[PDB]
C-alpha cells in the first residue's frame, strides 16, 4: 500500500530525471543558463542552492531506506549528479558539507565529490585546490567520526594521486603535515589512510619532503613493531602492507636519505608475516635497483647475526637469501673487492648456521647450497691481491 | 564493514601505482625456501612496464570519451543561447560574428552550385538562341 506507492513515486521521479531534445533534457537547460551571459547571477545562485537541497534530499532517502526501491533511488541519484557541471557541483556541495548535520549524509557527500574528479582532466586544477582546502579545514572537526575521518583522507589521497604535482605547493605541504599527525591516531583505519597519504605526498614532493623525514620513517618503524604484537587486529594485513608500501614509495623517491635507515627497512620486510611473499619479494627488488649495493652488503651482515640467524622463520631466511643473491649478481667489480672482508665475515657465519639452526637436514642442505653458489659468484669478480689474504 | 572496504581500497590503489604486477589484497620447509627463490627470478622477469601501459590506456579512453561528451553537450546549449538571443535581439558582438561567419560559409558553398561566370557567358548566348526561335513573337 504505502510502500508500493513510494516504489511507483520514485519511478515517477526517475522518469522525469532520466536523460532518455534540448527543451526536454534538464541537463542541457542548466548548461544554457550557465552559458547564457545575460542570465542573472542571482538566478544562477538559485540553481546551485536548489540542487544542494535536491542532492541532500535523495541522499536522505538512500541513507534511511526494499531492495527494488533502494536501486531506484540510485537511479535518481545518478541522474541528479549529472544535472550540473563540475564547476557548479563543487560550489553547490562543498558549503553543504559543513551545513549537513548527519554523519551519514556527510559520508555520502564526500564520496560523490571524489567520483566527479575520477574522470576529469587538468581543467579542474583550480577547482581541486578549493576542494582540498575545504577538506583540510574540516579534518580537525570530523576527528570524532572514524568513517568520515578515513573517507576524507582517502579522497585527498586520490586527489594527490591524480595531477597532484599541478596542485599548489602549500596544500601539498599542508596535507603532508596533516597526515604525519594522524599516523599516531589509535584507530587502525586512520593509520592506514594516513600512511597512504604520506606515500602519495612524498612521491609528489620528492626531496622537498626531507624536512618531514624524521616524522615519517622513525614513527613508521615503531608502528610496525606494535603491529606484530597486535595479531588480533582485523586489519593487520592491510596495516602491514600500508607500512611496506610506504617504504616502497620512498625507496624509489629518496634512496640516498633512506640509505642510513635501510637496516630497519629490511627488518620490516623480513618479519612482516601477514604480507604475502610476492609483495615482500617485489619491494626487495626496488632496494637493489635504487639503493647503493655497498651499504646493503654491510647491513646484510648485521641483520643476519642479530635477528635472522636466531629467528628460525623460514620466510625470513628465504627472503634474506633472495636479497643476498641479488646483491652479489649486481654488485660491481670495484664494489665487490672493497667489501670483500665484510662478505667473507658473513660467509663464515652462514657456514656455521647448521650448528644453531633448528630446521631439519633438507632445509639446511638447501640453504647451504644457495650459500655456496653466491660465494663462488662473489669470489669470482675479484683479483688475486684481495683474495689471497682472505683465503 | 565499510571501514574494512575503505582500508582495502586505499591499499589496493597504492599496489597498482607502485607494484603493478603484484596481486591485490582480498609442508616441508625446504620446499618453501625453493618456491621463494624461484619467485625471485620469475618476478624479476615480469613485464611490469606493459602492465602500466594498459592501465594508462584504459583510463585515457574513459577520460577522452567523457571529454567529448562535454564538448558535444556544451555545443548544443551554446547554439540554443544563440537561438534565444537572436530571437529577442540580445545578439552580442561575439554572437553576431559567429552568425556572420555562417552567412559566409553558406554563401560560399552555394557559389559552387552557382557555377563560373565564364560558362554563363556562353550559356546565356545559347539560351537566347533557343528561346528566340521557340518563343518566336517576331510577328
Amino acid at each position: 500500500e504505502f510502500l508500493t506507492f513510494m516504489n511507483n513515486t520514485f519511478e515517477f521521479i526517475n522518469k522525469i530525471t532520466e536523460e532518455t531534445d534540448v527543451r526536454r533534457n534538464l541537463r542541457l537547460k542548466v548548461y544554457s543558463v550557465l552559458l547564457d551571459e545575460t542570465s542573472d547571477k542571482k538566478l544562477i545562485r538559485n540553481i546551485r542552492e536548489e540542487f544542494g537541497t535536491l542532492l541532500e534530499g535523495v541522499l536522505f532517502f538512500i541513507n534511511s531506506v526494499t531492495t527494488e526501491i533502494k536501486e531506484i533511488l540510485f537511479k535518481v541519484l545518478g541522474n541528479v549528479l549529472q544535472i550540473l557541471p563540475v564547476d557548479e557541483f563543487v560550489n553547490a556541495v562543498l558549503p553543504l558539507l559543513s551545513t549537513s548535520t548527519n554523519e551519514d549524509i556527510r559520508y555520502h557527500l564526500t564520496l560523490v565529490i571524489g567520483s566527479k574528479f575520477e574522470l576529469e582532466g587538468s581543467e579542474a586544477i583550480p577547482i581541486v585546490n578549493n576542494v582540498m582546502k575545504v577538506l583540510l579545514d574540516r579534518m580537525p572537526l570530523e576527528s570524532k567520526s572514524v568513517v568520515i575521518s578515513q573517507v576524507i583522507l582517502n579522497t585527498m589521497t586520490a586527489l594527490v594521486s591524480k595531477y597532484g604535482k599541478k596542485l599548489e605547493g602549500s596544500i601539498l605541504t599542508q596535507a603532508l603535515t596533516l597526515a604525519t599527525e594522524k599516523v599516531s591516531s589509535d584507530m587502525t583505519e586512520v593509520k592506514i589512510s594516513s600512511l597512504a597519504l604520506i606515500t602519495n605526498c612524498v612521491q609528489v614532493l620528492g626531496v622537498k619532503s626531507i624536512a618531514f623525514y624524521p616524522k615519517i620513517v622513525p614513527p613508521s618503524i615503531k608502528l610496525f613493531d606494535a603491529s606484530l604484537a597486535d595479531s588480533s587486529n582485523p586489519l593487520k594485513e592491510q596495516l602491514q602492507v600500508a607500512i611496506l608500501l610506504l617504504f616502497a614509495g620512498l625507496i624509489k623517491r629518496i634512496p640516498s636519505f633512506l640509505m642510513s635507515n635501510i637496516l630497519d627497512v629490511l627488518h620490516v620486510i623480513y618479519f612482516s608475516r601477514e604480507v604475502d611473499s610476492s609483495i615482500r619479494l617485489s619491494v626487495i627488488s626496488l632496494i637493489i635497483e635504487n639503493i647503493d649495493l655497498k651499504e646493503v652488503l654491510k647491513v646484510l651482515f648485521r641483520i643476519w647475526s642479530t635477528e635472522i640467524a636466531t629467528s628460525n622463520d623460514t620466510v625470513a631466511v628465504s627472503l634474506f637469501l633472495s636479497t643476498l643473491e641479488s646483491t652479489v649478481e649486481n654488485i660491481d667489480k670495484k664494489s665487490a673487492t672493497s667489501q670483500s672482508p665484510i662478505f667473507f665475515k658473513l660467509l663464515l657465519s652462514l657456514f656455521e648456521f647448521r650448528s644453531i639452526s633448528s630446521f631439519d637436514n633438507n632445509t639446511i642442505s638447501r640453504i647451504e647450497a644457495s650459500v655456496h653458489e653466491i660465494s663462488n659468484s662473489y669470489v669470482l669478480k675479484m683479483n688475486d691481491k684481495v683474495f689471497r689474504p682472505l683465503f | 564493514q565499510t571501514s574494512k572496504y575503505q582500508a582495502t581500497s586505499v591499499v589496493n590503489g597504492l599496489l597498482s601505482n607502485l607494484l603493478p604486477g603484484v596481486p591485490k589484497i582480498r609442508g616441508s620447509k625446504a620446499q618453501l625456501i625453493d618456491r621463494n627463490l624461484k619467485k625471485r627470478v620469475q618476478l624479476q622477469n615480469r613485464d611490469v612496464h606493459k602492465i602500466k601501459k594498459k592501465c594508462k590506456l584504459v583510463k585515457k579512453k574513459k577520460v577522452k570519451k567523457h571529454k567529448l561528451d562535454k564538448e558535444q553537450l556544451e555545443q548544443l546549449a551554446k547554439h540554443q543561447v544563440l537561438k534565444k538571443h537572436q530571437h529577442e535581439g540580445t545578439l552580442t558582438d561575439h554572437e553576431r560574428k559567429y552568425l556572420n561567419k555562417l552567412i559566409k560559409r553558406n554563401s560560399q558553398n552555394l557559389r559552387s552550385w552557382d557555377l563560373e561566370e565564364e560558362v554563363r557567358d556562353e550559356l546565356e548566348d545559347i539560351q537566347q538562341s533557343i528561346l528566340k526561335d521557340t518563343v518566336s513573337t517576331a510577328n
Binding site: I62, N63, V65, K70, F74, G78, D104, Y107, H108, L111, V112, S115, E118, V147 | Q1, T2, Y5, Q6
Partner: peptide
C-alpha cells in the same frame, strides 16, 4: 528432422560503498 534440430542447436563505484554502509 530431429537430427537437424540437434545440428541447429550446436551451431557506479559509489553504489557498492553506499550499500555496505547501510548494512552497518
Amino acid at each position: 528432422k530431429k537430427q537437424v534440430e540437434q545440428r541447429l542447436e550446436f551451431y557506479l563505484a559509489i553504489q557498492e560503498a553506499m550499500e555496505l554502509y547501510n548494512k552497518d
